[PDB]
Amino acid sequence: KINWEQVKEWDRKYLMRTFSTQNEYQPVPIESTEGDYLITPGGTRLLDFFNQLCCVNLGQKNQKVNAAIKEALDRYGFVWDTYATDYKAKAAKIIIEDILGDEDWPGKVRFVSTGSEAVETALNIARLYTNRPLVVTREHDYHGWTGGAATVTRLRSFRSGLVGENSESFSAQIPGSSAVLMAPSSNTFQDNYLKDENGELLSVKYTRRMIENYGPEQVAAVITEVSQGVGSTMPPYEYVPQIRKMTKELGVLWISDEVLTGFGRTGKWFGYQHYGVQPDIITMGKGLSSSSLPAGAVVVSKEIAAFMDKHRWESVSTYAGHPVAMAAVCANLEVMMEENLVEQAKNSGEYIRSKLELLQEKHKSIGNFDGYGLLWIVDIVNAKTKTPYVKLDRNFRHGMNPNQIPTQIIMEKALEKGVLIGGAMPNTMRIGASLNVSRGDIDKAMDALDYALDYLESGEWQ
Amino acid sequence: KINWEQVKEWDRKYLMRTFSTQNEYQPVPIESTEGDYLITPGGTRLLDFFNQLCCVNLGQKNQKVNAAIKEALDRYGFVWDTYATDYKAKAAKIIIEDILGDEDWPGKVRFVSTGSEAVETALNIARLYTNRPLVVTREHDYHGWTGGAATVTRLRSFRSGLVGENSESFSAQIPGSSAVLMAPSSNTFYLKDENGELLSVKYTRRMIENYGPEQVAAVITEVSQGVGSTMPPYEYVPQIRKMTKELGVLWISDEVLTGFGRTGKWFGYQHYGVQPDIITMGKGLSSSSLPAGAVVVSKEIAAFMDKHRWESVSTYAGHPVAMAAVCANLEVMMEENLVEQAKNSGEYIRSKLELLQEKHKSIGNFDGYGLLWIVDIVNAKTKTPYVKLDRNFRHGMNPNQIPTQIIMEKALEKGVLIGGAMPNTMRIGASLNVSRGDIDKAMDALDYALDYLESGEWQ
Amino acid sequence: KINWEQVKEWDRKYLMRTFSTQNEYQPVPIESTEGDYLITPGGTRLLDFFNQLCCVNLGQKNQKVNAAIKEALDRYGFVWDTYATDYKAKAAKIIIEDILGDEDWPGKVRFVSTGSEAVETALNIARLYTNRPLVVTREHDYHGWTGGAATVTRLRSFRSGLVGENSESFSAQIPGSSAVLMAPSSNTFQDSNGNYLKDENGELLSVKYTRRMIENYGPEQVAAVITEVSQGVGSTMPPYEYVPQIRKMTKELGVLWISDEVLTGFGRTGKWFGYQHYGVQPDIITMGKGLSSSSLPAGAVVVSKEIAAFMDKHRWESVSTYAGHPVAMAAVCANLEVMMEENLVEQAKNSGEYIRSKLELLQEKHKSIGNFDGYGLLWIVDIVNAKTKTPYVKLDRNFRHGMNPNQIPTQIIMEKALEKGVLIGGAMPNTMRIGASLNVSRGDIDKAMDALDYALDYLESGEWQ
Amino acid sequence: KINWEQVKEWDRKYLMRTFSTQNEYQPVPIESTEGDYLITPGGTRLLDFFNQLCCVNLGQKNQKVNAAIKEALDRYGFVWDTYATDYKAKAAKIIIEDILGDEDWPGKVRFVSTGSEAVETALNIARLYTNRPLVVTREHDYHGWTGGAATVTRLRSFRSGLVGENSESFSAQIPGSSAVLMAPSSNTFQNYLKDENGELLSVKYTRRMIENYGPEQVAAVITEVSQGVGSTMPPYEYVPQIRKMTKELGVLWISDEVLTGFGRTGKWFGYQHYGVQPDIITMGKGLSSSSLPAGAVVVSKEIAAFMDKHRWESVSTYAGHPVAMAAVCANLEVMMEENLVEQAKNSGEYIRSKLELLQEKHKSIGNFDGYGLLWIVDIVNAKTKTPYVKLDRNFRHGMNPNQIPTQIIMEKALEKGVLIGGAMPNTMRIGASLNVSRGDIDKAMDALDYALDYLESGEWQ
Ligand SMILES: Cc1ncc(COP(=O)(O)O)c(CN[C@@H](C)C(=O)O)c1O
Ligand SMILES: Cc1ncc(COP(=O)(O)O)c(CN[C@@H](C)C(=O)O)c1O
Ligand SMILES: Cc1ncc(COP(=O)(O)O)c(CN[C@@H](C)C(=O)O)c1O
Ligand SMILES: Cc1ncc(COP(=O)(O)O)c(CN[C@@H](C)C(=O)O)c1O
């Protein structure tokens, strides 16, 4: 017997709040999950189209994955990275030989526990490989929350600072918070994205002038999200190819931060593979294990691997490569390959596109949408004016009243229909589900969006 | 059927090395673990007196922990911090109400995944609460490897930099590795004030005063230095808590290593009659069964954070299956009284170490509590350490010149794993429930290893 | 009777080089100066159309300025800024009531010794006033060489690093070199034909991106934007609407505007200060060069009444030994008293108009002159390959000094002009930075332009290759 | 005919305040200066035992230095650093061959306008030469107010921050105020504690700090041989041990001689009391005896050679200012010719003995030390034998000056005609011209005697 009133009391009383003050907070307990659904203590089933944080690629509580964890618990236990296990070595091989086997740039994997720890590892390797201090990031990027990963995060609403409750008054960012350069977002400069008559996007051209103003000899790496997860954008098609050609011409590394866009999320194994370019470093988390257990990774190129191999690297993480986490990655990745979830995700994206077309023609509050596989960004506008309700947009902070935030009104409304859908940004949806989400579930979720958008466009909420 | 020949191949070929070059590296496979033992694929049983990284407090592969986990897998799944679950809520309650119940300073918990992450969170909170930029650390502290945690880590041999193979020439720290003051180690100077204050504390005070207390958020300590391998003078901890209070600065006690029974008490600081403002946790929190880390803050600090919206997310923070593993691990320590058992075993080790120091002039000094012991190693004839740079070394030097490496190699001939990170200093640990027989086996193997050290044949 | 050969040995032997290796170094001694001329020990008279560093506004060795200095020496000696003197008090008053008397935003002045120290001061003041850490600068700005001033300098060719002798393998910046944001230059985001791009709302994309940058970090994090009205060392002229758009953007974002007026200040641009061409007023001005026309070392910062009242409420724990030096102050008094009464600002205006019509003619004649713009005694000329119509030096303002001077058009031009006894050129590889005294003659202008003609002839024969 | 009533109004109204709020401030004008005297508008003669800022070594308005300037003004005008002048060349030559001519380490000079600009330069050169980022400084050092020079200043009362007026409420340092490590002050750990090997614990801890970071990370240690603003004297072994330590660690030593340079201490330079030689010297103050603003840096032959192989991309407009250099030459030619260093040693040995007597006569002098025309005097409470102002060199100017012993001595001294006192609250920093007369030294020393009389009676409380 679980006493759920008591669980809520303890949860109020003994856990530090994130995003809500204690005063406004209402615990939302989840007793179990499976597939694309969350089950409340009462037995209510909630369709999860945030997919938590787009990190449960394979589906909640996969039967093969759980079984593989249970088998792994017959042997382990725990050993640190200095010891070898079948699970750690198999997971590395699966990534290099099976998943990325058709590309010849990958050299080696390091496993860690979180996407943040992943981005920390890759910034560290990039600076050591080039012997250079500076790393370029882009406006609105999110690469993590930990010190180093946070320095390349350029959302002021996600930097572990503090805001007040429906107020501008009580805000601070963490005091003292660098060896980092902010380049233009892929979505900056558009009136249709502006180019320079050689065809280079103005976001890329001024990224190049920045790197040249500092000196390419000072700059280790450019770190990108192919599509911004928390920041919620899709790039112009030429953007990724152009950042790759630029970085190569400048002798600078390219790190694709694949924590969110990795493992089938975009109808391909990785976000980058949509554009015909290969990176120098990849960071991983989320879909790596489909959140069955905490895991993160970085893959480096042969050349970087060869350089690192020549020295003793004085770096230790206690839980890096934890064998039970690794067995989980093995099973997750094995299910993905044998069940063709990358293709399944691809086909389901195409079904989503066409629902999104139908909704756009019905709802003038949908300013625009794009995405692929199971990653969709939907831009919301005021239907009469065609412009964003919330002026600061991706530069907002959480100090504002949630019932003025369009993605919040939508989420509240969708909920009347057992569906969870919304976004991190105020004017933008970030829709994700499992790669194997069923058609009836997309149908239910799109219908709930339809019902919410009605309410939004009606104005009864102002 | 596991092909271990292959596994080592895949291990050589596709995983990045740490602490070894590719050319020197040889895979050391471990097929399974049980208790205080590790088992090789061929079936050699290795007695683990590292306790990996002093982080398997419960014993390896606890059947009750493993069953509690298997159970949580019937329901889960994954929900991020925004969702409440029984395991996350129970876990916080056990720490606040159950483990820390007789202390009234603690307020709330945040769960994260690793000790480094816990340290990041503590740094953030401290700076946020005080509205101040600077954090004080001490020489030879280890607080983790990620960005923020690294800045307060003062071991040049564990900052994720690069060294060569048996060579002084291929060295580098990470380019651009800043809101952080390094104070002296407790093990410095034992000289005092005549108003009785240790000089190390006095100068730490004088530091905070030179920048100005209004600039300084927090002093972060390890009660006993873990990777750095020290024990303090008894007076160090209370005089820090007092100095920080007087100047209105926070004290974070970094209990990632010393926490959950390691020292014969629930926490390292509990040996010293003081309460911290903030504590960081990992390792023994889940006994490494699954990746978990935590921060406990005071009622004062928690109340303050509670008035604000905190714009921080970590995907895996509060992972319900990790939290189920924490619940069980903690429930086992409480019901088996293992903190008590750690204290009692610690006293047996003290007396065993005495017979060693008596039998071996290369043991310069030792000290510890529960299942954490630092043994200082010296040249039996000169009575000084073998490796001159001591805790300021880097891993560029040849391991056949590092006493603690020589000790491990020899100890291994007895099937025992014992040694340390530091070149002249041992860090000995085992499970809270290590039996008298295993302690005996490890100390015997230590005997044999120091026998080899003192003969100087390794030169 | 000076031994100038020994002066040459000693200069070679005991002075640290700047911009040259010891081996390539050939000292150029100057025995004296007068007006717009430099005079060698042997008696070569060199027409100085660099005006040294756009810093000798009044002219070299003005007799009244030097006589005022000589007079000051019957009294001083030295006192530090804790004592008041007539000279310091007059200087501040001339700046506030007389020069800036038509504008009502100005509050107080603090004097220092250099333009760098002036920028340091301003940066300190803005951050204290706002209680915010970040300062926004621009691409290719130069704001000085000292610690803080350097951080807002975005020229990798002038951040006090080291390059090689016709090589970039020796090449290093100062290790370490930080609460600064780099905004796009006024001159970034122009098409292949030179039009600056605009919002369709009319806002220059450069300003639009600057705003976006500020809102990304949060305006509560940002103290000030520091600008040059006209980039001096970087050698640019803005679109007319840039200066007004930045003032309006800073106002809206609650951020300060610092006009770095060290080079463009005091007549340089045919008005008292650069910003007065643009119908806006800054929060803080930094000053130097033309403040004393280099007669003695002198820097300054002017701050608004609001900033002044706030700083007045507090004890400021800042000391600089030489700040306010009475003899340097007396030099500013005389310098400024001459500029006012000889109408040198109005004079500067009129000369520039004449220069414009000279360079118009030089452009019609020389296809290597891609473009030019300036005002008063500050002019920029972009140089191109007459044939390809692009600049010869592809890295442009992101170059460093490791490259071979005989491939730098601005070096070749300078060489050739020296054949006509004329000193002219630029710090940037593709762009000339022309300045003389505010009172230069028509003939000395004609003499400079003719040499530029001659130089451009040689540039176009390509024989320098 | 100057209207000094107008000079005051304009001074109050148009000058930014330092150290004083607009409300409390009252202008102290100085109409002329001569030798060791300052002259007010009304004709009052103030004997200056601060020597302004220990920066007018030669004496105020030296008639020879002043005439040299006038001569230079017959020819200049202004040239920047790329053009060679007789004055700039002679000044560097005087410094290297005549002044430092008995030590064979000094290589090249760069002239700048201020002491801070001189420190900036040194830091830049040290980091470039070693290709290392970190500079070690010491608790209570003062090395300037400009960006880089401020990073190595460790006195919170001099970091260009703001405090309130008799109040703890309105204080702030600059947002942003970093590649610098602060090592213990020479005067930390006191008899100063030593190593079992004789090494001072302050030096021992500096070494372990550099070793903790890695000597391969550390460009240089910058010191004041004797702390100026900070107001201290080192134990005799400190300077030699820091010199030995830096060499042992492959690390540069910057002697900041901005204050202690050019005779101040009864030798040419502060370090020269100690039998060692720095890798770099920074200079200001005594360089021109403040006749016109100058600063300079002197580097070793090794450092010079490395610099000479490169094009250095550094420009300072007034660096090398030709009139500033003619001021410098004449200043140095007078110092060498009047044997000012030797004169200074001698007046130092006279002052030592005057202070001794003052110490016998006054229990509030806890301690004194110095040399030449630089003397530090530790002011203590006669009853407890401890300092009046507990935060001592870690204070800030937010406190009421009527409670600062150095403010009290000052105002009572001003009653006898003599400006004497110091920057630190419990420490006097006494300086005069190198050619200060015996009569003036006697007069100042009486004035201190009179002042300490008032301090010790405690009517000020
Ligand atoms: C691209 C990217 N990199 C790195 C991270 C950090 O990974 P961890 O959360 O495992 O530390 C995230 C997390 N995102 C979450 C916050 C999201 O999608 O809302 C991410 O999307
Ligand atoms: C006191 C302390 N804090 C923080 C950490 C870092 O925690 P994670 O490894 O979970 O990030 C450690 C780890 N130490 C390890 C390296 C050891 O004991 O060898 C530690 O001892
Ligand atoms: C806009 C601007 N700000 C600040 C400075 C720094 O002033 P000082 O050099 O006096 O410290 C300069 C100088 N420039 C010079 C060097 C030039 O035009 O070459 C400048 O042009
Ligand atoms: C040792 C030292 N270095 C560097 C400086 C900076 O020089 P400038 O003030 O010219 O920039 C000083 C000045 N000090 C003054 C403030 C004093 O004696 O109190 C100094 O004493």
DSSP for D23-80, please give it: TT----B--EEEBTEEE-TT--EEEETTHHHHT-TT-BT-HHHHHHHHHHTTT-S---
Task: State the smallest CA–CA distance between residue B218 and chain D in angstroms.
Answer: 18
Type of residue found at B306? D
Residue of D nearest to C59 (CA): D77
Cα dihedral C201→C203→C207→C210 (10° resolution): -10
Q: Are B211 and D394 within 8 A, CB to CB?
A: no
Residue C304 near residue C283, CB atoms below 8 Å: yes
Residues 6+ apart with CB under 8 A from B156: B173, B392, B394, D212, D213, D214
Residue type, D57: N
Task: Measure the CA angle with vertex D164, ends D161 and D165; round to 5°.
Answer: 135
DSSP code, position B99: I
Spatial neighbors of D320 by CB under 8 A, at least 6 apart, are D79, D80, D81, D85, D88, D111
Cis peptide before D77 (omega within 30 of 0): yes
d(CA C247, CA C253): 10
What is the full DSSP assignment across A346-397?
Answer: HHHHHHHHHHHHHHHHH-TTEEEEEEETTEEEEEE--TTT-S-SSTTGGG--
* Beta-carbon separation of A14 and B92 below 8 A: yes
**Cα(A158)–Cα(A230) distance, rounded to whole angstroms?**
9
The answer to whether A176 faces chain B, any CB pair under 8 Å, is yes
- C312, D95 in Cβ contact below 8 A? no
Residues with CB under 6 A from ligand 1: A 53-54, 114-116, 119, 142-145, 225, 229-230, 257, 259-260, 285, 424; B 313-316
Peptide bond into B228 cis (omega under 30): no
Using a CB-CB cut-off of 8 Å, the residues of chain C touching A139 are 212-213, 216
**Which structure tokens are listed for D4?**
């000094």
What DSSP string describes D149-209?
Answer: HHTT---TTSSS-EE-SS-STT-B--TT---EEEEPPTT------B-TTS-BHHHHHHHHH
Distance C289 CA to ligand 3 centre (A): 8
> What are the C-alpha distances in Å from C405 to residues B323, C366, D371?
67, 22, 52
Please state, in angstroms and as integers, the Cα–Cα distance from residue A1 to each residue in A6, B70, B77, following that order.
Answer: 12, 18, 20
C387 and chain A: CB distance < 8 Å anywhere? no
Distance CA D421, CA D29 (A): 19
Distances (CA, A) of A345 to A236, A371, C358: 21, 12, 69
- Residue A142 CA to ligand 1 centre (angstroms): 7
A238 and A31 in contact (C-beta within 8 Å)? no
CB of B53 within 6 A of ligand 2: the answer is yes
**Method used to solve the structure:** X-ray
CA distances from D299 to C27, C173, D3, D254 (A): 21, 19, 48, 9
- Distance, in Å, from the CA atom of C435 to the CA atom of C348, rounded to the nearest integer, reads 11
Could you say which residues from 263 to 292 on chain B have a Cβ atom under 8 Å away from some Cβ of chain A? 282-283, 287-291
Is A188–C212 a contact, with Cβ atoms under 8 angstroms apart? yes
CA–CA gap between residue B69 and residue B65 (Å, rounded): 6
Q: Which of A12, A399, A174 is nearest to B302 (CA)?
A: A12
Size of interface B-D (CB pairs under 8 A): 50
Calpha distance D275→A241 (Å, rounded): 64
Query: How deeply is C220 buried, as exposed, middle or buried, from its count of CB atoms within 10 A (0-12, 13-18, 19+)?
Result: middle
Distance CA C336, CA C249 (A): 33
Task: For residue C29, list its beta bridge partners.
Answer: D84
In angstroms, the CA D93 to CA D195 distance is: 42
Contact in structure between A220 and A148 (CB atoms under 8 Å): no
> 3-state DSSP helix/strand/coil percent for chain B, to nearest 5?
40, 15, 45
Beta bridge partners of C299: C112
| Alpha-carbon dihedral sign for residues A48, A52, A58, A63 | negative
- Note whether A79 contacts B146, CB cutoff 8 Å: no
Tell me the residue type at A345. A
Look at A206 and C192 and tell me if their CB atoms are within 8 Å: no
CB pairs under 8 A between A and C: 61
Which residue in chain C has the smallest CA separation from D313? C160
Measured in residues, chain A has a length of 462
Contact A103, A301 (CB under 8 A): no
Q: Which residue of C has its CA nearest to D37?
A: C77
Q: Is the four-CA dihedral D95, D100, D101, D104 of positive or negative sign?
A: negative
Interior CA angle at D20 toward D14 and D24, to 5°?
Answer: 90
Name which residue sits closest to atom 13 of ligand 2, judged by CA.
B144
* Residue A174: closest C-alpha in chain C: C221
What are the residue ranges of helices labelled H in C143-204? Answer: 147-151
Chain B residues close to A73, C-beta within 8 Å: 61, 66, 69-70
d(CA D442, CA B428): 70
Give the Cα separation of B265 and B224 in Å (integer): 13
CB of A186 closer than 8 Å to CB of B185: no
Sorted by where each starts, the structural domains of chain C and their CATH numbers stand as 1-61+343-465 (3.90.1150.10), 62-342 (3.40.640.10)
Q: How many whole angstroms separate alpha carbon D401 and alpha carbon D424?
A: 11
**Interface residue C394 vs chain A (CB under 8 A):** no
* Measured torsion, CA atoms of residues D198, D200, D206, D210, in degrees rounded to the nearest 10: -10
Which atom of ligand 4 lies nearest, measured to the CA of D259? 21
Name the phi and psi angles at C331, rounded to 5: -65, -40
Question: Is the Cβ of D101 closer than 8 Å to some Cβ of chain C?
Answer: no
* Nearest Cα to Cα of residue C119 among C224, C214, C253: C224
Among C79, C81, C319, smallest CA distance to D31 is for C79
Resolution (A): 2.3
Q: Do B171 and D216 touch (CB under 8 A)?
A: yes
Which residues touch B140 (CB under 8 Å, ≥6 apart)? B154, B155, B185, B187, B225, B228, B230, B391, D212
Residue in chain C closest to D5 (alpha carbons) equals C86
Structure-block tokens of residue D383: 């009853």
Whether residue C93 lies within 8 A of chain D, CB to CB, comes out as: yes
3-state SS assignment for residue D284: coil
Phi, psi of B285 (to 5 degrees): -50, -45
A213 contacts C182? CB cut-off 8 A: yes
In chain D, residues 132-151 whose CB comes closer than 8 Å to chain B: 139-140
B393: which chain A residues are within 8 Å (Cβ-Cβ)?
none
Tell me how far apart the alpha carbons of residues D416 and D49 are, in angstroms, rounded to a whole number. 12
Ligand 3 atom index nearest CA of C228: 1
Q: Are C246 and C270 in contact, with CB atoms under 8 Å apart?
A: no
Q: Which two tokens stand for residue C297?
A: 């070392």
**Residue A54 corresponds to which tokens in the numbers above?**
């787009």
Atom of ligand 1 nearest to the CA of A424: 19
Closest CA to D159 of B329, B210, B41: B210
- What the block records as the tokens of D109 is 């000079």
Phi, psi angles (nearest 5°) of residue D415: -70, -25
